[PDB]
Amino acid sequence: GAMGSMERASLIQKAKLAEQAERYEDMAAFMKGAVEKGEELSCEERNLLSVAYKNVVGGQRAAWRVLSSIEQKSNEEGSEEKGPEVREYREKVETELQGVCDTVLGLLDSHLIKEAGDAESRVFYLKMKGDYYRYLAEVATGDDKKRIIDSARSAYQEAMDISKKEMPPTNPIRLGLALNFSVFHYEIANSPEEAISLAKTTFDEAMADLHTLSEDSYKDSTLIMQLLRDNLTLWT
Amino acid sequence: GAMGSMERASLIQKAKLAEQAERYEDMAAFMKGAVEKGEELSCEERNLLSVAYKNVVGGQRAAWRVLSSIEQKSNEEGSEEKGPEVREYREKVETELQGVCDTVLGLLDSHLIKEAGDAESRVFYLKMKGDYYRYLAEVATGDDKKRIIDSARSAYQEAMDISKKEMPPTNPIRLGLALNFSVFHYEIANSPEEAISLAKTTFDEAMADLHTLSEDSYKDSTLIMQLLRDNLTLWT
Amino acid sequence: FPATV
Amino acid sequence: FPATV
Numbered sequence: 001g002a003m004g005s006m007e008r009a010s011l012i013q014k015a016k017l018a019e020q021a022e023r024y025e026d027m028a029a030f031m032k033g034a035v036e037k038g039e040e041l042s043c044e045e046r047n048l049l050s051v052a053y054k055n056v057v058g059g060q061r062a063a064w065r066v067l068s069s070i071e072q073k074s075n076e077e078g079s080e081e082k083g084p085e086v087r088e089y090r091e092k093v094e095t096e097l098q099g100v101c102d103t104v105l106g107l108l109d110s111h112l113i114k115e116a117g118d119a120e121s122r123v124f125y126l127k128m129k130g131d132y133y134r135y136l137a138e139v140a141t142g143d144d145k146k147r148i149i150d151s152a153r154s155a156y157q158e159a160m161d162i163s164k165k166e167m168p169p170t171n172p173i174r175l176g177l178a179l180n181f182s183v184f185h186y187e188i189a190n191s192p193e194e195a196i197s198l199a200k201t202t203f204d205e206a207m208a209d210l211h212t213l214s215e216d217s218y219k220d221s222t223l224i225m226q227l228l229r230d231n232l233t234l235w236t
Numbered sequence: 237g238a239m240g241s242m243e244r245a246s247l248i249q250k251a252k253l254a255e256q257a258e259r260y261e262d263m264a265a266f267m268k269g270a271v272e273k274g275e276e277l278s279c280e281e282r283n284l285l286s287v288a289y290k291n292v293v294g295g296q297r298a299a300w301r302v303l304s305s306i307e308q309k310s311n312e313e314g315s316e317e318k319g320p321e322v323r324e325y326r327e328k329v330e331t332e333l334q335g336v337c338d339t340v341l342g343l344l345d346s347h348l349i350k351e352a353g354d355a356e357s358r359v360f361y362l363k364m365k366g367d368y369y370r371y372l373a374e375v376a377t378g379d380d381k382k383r384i385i386d387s388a389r390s391a392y393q394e395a396m397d398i399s400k401k402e403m404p405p406t407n408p409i410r411l412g413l414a415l416n417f418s419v420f421h422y423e424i425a426n427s428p429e430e431a432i433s434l435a436k437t438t439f440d441e442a443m444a445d446l447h448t449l450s451e452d453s454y455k456d457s458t459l460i461m462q463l464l465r466d467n468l469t470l471w472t
Numbered sequence: 473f474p475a476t477v
Numbered sequence: 478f479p480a481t482v
């Protein structure tokens with residue numbers, strides 16, 4: 001790996017600089033290098049890893065959606081034939097996106113998840129696994145689509161089980177996991193009722209636990225609770 | 237080149253798709269491929285080329301400025317020593333930026349400028365040459381800095397001479413050239429009075445020619461005139 | 473699109 | 478920063 005010669009601490013330092021400079025591809029490459037040093041990641045480091053790849057794949061997903069929409073319009077009745085270029089370019093972006101997802105899933109499998117024993121780390125990584133399989137599912141149209149969806153589901157479900165046993169209902173990781181699994185249900189699994197039920201139960205159980213929190217923890221939890229509410233408002 | 241096997245028209249088509257998807261690195265690569273086909277570029281194609289590289293280098297410049305500011309702060313009195321990482325990463329971004337500039341200047345030299353005979357094309361390309369030497373000048377600190385600055389100046393001056401002879405004072409290319417050369421004077425050549433004089437004369441001569449224009453041309457010219465005014469307001 | 477984190 | 482095009 002190109003980062004093999006750089007110190008772990010230097011990779012972390014540079015990931016933080018890259019974030020400040022909004023250089024998310026660089027940030028992701030630095031954090032991949034840091035993971036490949038083989039040591040576990042701290043909370044802060046896990047969040048650097050997630051921010052980097054979320055931004056990279058987020059941009060790819062947005063581009064894929066633009067191109068997919070153009071492609072769909074090209075296959076409507078009355079649309080003039082423009083050749084293979086729209087499909088080709090959508091495929092190019094799609095392949096790049098799948099590559100990033102495979103990279104992230106590879107880091108999780110080699111060997112972040114297996115060494116993650118604390119609830120905070122294990123849930124975080126399993127949520128990531130669900131998320132990146134979800135992104136693969138968004139673009140999947142073939143024989144493996146069902147298996148990709150089931151891989152996302154399975155990762156989210158393991159994360160949910162741990163989070164419910166080991167974390168308070170206001171824990172931001174738990175809340176964010178539930179938010180994203182709810183979106184999985186709505187957008188991927190064709191299960192809007194499950195999505196709504198999960199978002200509502202999560203919100204209500206968090207509300208009941210806010211009284212236990214400091215001012216700063218309250219701020220963190222209520223921010224994510226508002227995202228749950230926003231989705232519920234969109235869906236009802 | 238990786239685009240050597242793709243049709244010119246397909247490269248242009250895909251550049252337009254990449255623009256829609258805000259995939260400016262792809263857009264630039266497609267347009268580089270189109271230039272390397274060896275045919276002259278139409279007005280629309282020249283603007284695709286410029287948009288692509290402007291966006292790419294614009295992002296690099298913004299990142300370089302963030303990193304340079306952090307580096308400057310690190311060399312103030314009382315700042316704790318953090319090692320070589322800030323300099324290294326600033327250098328990495330700088331080298332990438334210089335590479336993009338060299339790529340653009342290479343396309344202009346091989347062989348866009350020499351085949352550009354119409355005022356609209358030749359001025360456009362010479363403005364580009366000035367711009368990309370200006371971007372090199374922004375990051376230059378060595379023995380060649382004076383020569384880089386003079387290269388920008390020379391390109392802008394040739395463009396100015398042609399524009400004044402061959403284009404009306406409201407022509408958007410002429411106006412944009414003057415805008416950018418004025419910025420060169422202010423920010424690069426330490427010549428704020430020249431910058432102000434150029435912006436003011438350009439604005440005033442355009443104002444006097446607006447009466448000749450259609451509604452649509454008037455809109456185009458006044459938009460750029462407002463940028464001249466904005467700079468004058470900043471500088472006075 | 474719905475919110476995710 | 479000043480405006481350029």
Ligand SMILES: *CC(=O)Nc1ccc(-c2nc3ccccn3c2Nc2c(C)cc(O)cc2C)cc1
Pocket residue numbers: 043044046047050120123124127172173174175176177220223224477
């Ligand atoms: C140690 C740890 O992981 N702690 C942690 C990570 C991330 C968050 C967080 N806070 C906010 C606020 C607004 C929007 C998003 N976020 C996040 N993001 C996540 C959340 C909420 C949940 C998971 O599972 C992952 C992330 C990245 C708070 C605390």
Ligand SMILES: *CC(=O)Nc1ccc(-c2nc3ccccn3c2Nc2c(C)cc(O)cc2C)cc1
Pocket residue numbers: 279280282283286356359360363408409410411412413456459460482
């Ligand atoms: C054929 C040709 O080049 N025509 C042309 C190119 C670009 C513009 C133009 N219009 C606007 C409006 C708002 C902001 C910027 N611009 C541009 N950009 C340029 C300008 C004004 C001047 C030069 O020399 C290059 C560019 C890209 C209008 C007409």
Ligand SMILES: [Ca+2]
Pocket residue numbers: 078079080
């Ligand atoms: Ca038709």
Ligand SMILES: [Ca+2]
Pocket residue numbers: 082083084085246249
């Ligand atoms: Ca075609």
Ligand SMILES: [Ca+2]
Pocket residue numbers: 091094095
């Ligand atoms: Ca595919």
Ligand SMILES: [Ca+2]
Pocket residue numbers: 040115116117118
């Ligand atoms: Ca462990």
Ligand SMILES: [Ca+2]
Pocket residue numbers: 314315316
């Ligand atoms: Ca100190």
Ligand SMILES: [Ca+2]
Pocket residue numbers: 010013318319320321
């Ligand atoms: Ca250091």
Ligand SMILES: [Ca+2]
Pocket residue numbers: 327330331
């Ligand atoms: Ca350098």
Ligand SMILES: [Ca+2]
Pocket residue numbers: 276351352353354
């Ligand atoms: Ca010619």
Ligand SMILES: [Cl-]
Pocket residue numbers: 088089092250
């Ligand atoms: Cl392609």
Ligand SMILES: [Cl-]
Pocket residue numbers: 014324325328
């Ligand atoms: Cl570096």
Ligand SMILES: [Mg+2]
Pocket residue numbers: 007008
């Ligand atoms: Mg070491």
Ligand SMILES: [Mg+2]
Pocket residue numbers: none
């Ligand atoms: Mg359940």
Ligand SMILES: [Mg+2]
Pocket residue numbers: 243244
């Ligand atoms: Mg051909």
Ligand SMILES: [Mg+2]
Pocket residue numbers: none
């Ligand atoms: Mg003069």
